[PDB]
Design an enzyme around this catalytic site. Structure first.
Site, PDB file in Angstrom:
ATOM      1  N   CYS A  29       0.794  -1.220   0.000  1.00 25.36           N
ATOM      2  CA  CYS A  29       0.000   0.000   0.000  1.00 25.36           C
ATOM      3  C   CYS A  29       0.836   1.285   0.000  1.00 25.36           C
ATOM      4  CB  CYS A  29      -0.958  -0.041   1.192  1.00 25.36           C
ATOM      5  SG  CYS A  29      -1.817   1.517   1.541  1.00 25.36           S
ATOM      6  N   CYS A  32      -0.327   4.323   2.324  1.00 23.61           N
ATOM      7  CA  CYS A  32      -0.113   3.946   3.721  1.00 23.61           C
ATOM      8  C   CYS A  32       1.213   4.474   4.267  1.00 23.61           C
ATOM      9  CB  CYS A  32      -0.144   2.421   3.879  1.00 23.61           C
ATOM     10  SG  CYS A  32      -1.753   1.608   3.566  1.00 23.61           S
TER      11      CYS A  32
END
Length: 104
Positions: A29, A32
């Protein structure tokens, strides 16, 4: 920030005496990575007032399934064993602080 998984969830999150902020992330991700610094910083700033944990969806999908988390980054707030709010995306520090403040 302490990691939390399927085996420590009940203890660390649901039985916490203080509000809990949980950051759902995963190695693949990209966005993130942008909130990771903010999470560590807030954890330090509110030490003794809230508990902060991070859950890698790659290794503890069971929890993601329980709360029906389908996208990350996701930040969940818990208080007294109940999920109080969910936020998706690269949340700014200011927004996270507003939420932390209302549960205090």
């Amino acid at each position: 920030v302490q990691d939390v998984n399927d085996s420590s969830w009940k203890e660390f999150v649901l039985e916490s005496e203080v509000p809990v902020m949980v950051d759902f992330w995963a190695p693949w991700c990209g966005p993130c990575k942008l909130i990771a610094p903010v999470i560590d910083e807030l954890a330090k700033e509110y030490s003794g007032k809230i508990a902060v944990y991070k859950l890698n969806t790659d290794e503890a999908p069971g929890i993601a399934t329980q709360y029906n988390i389908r996208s990350i980054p996701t930040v969940l707030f818990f208080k007294n064993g109940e999920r109080k709010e969910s936020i998706i995306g690269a949340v700014p520090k200011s927004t996270l602080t507003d939420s932390i403040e209302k549960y205090l």
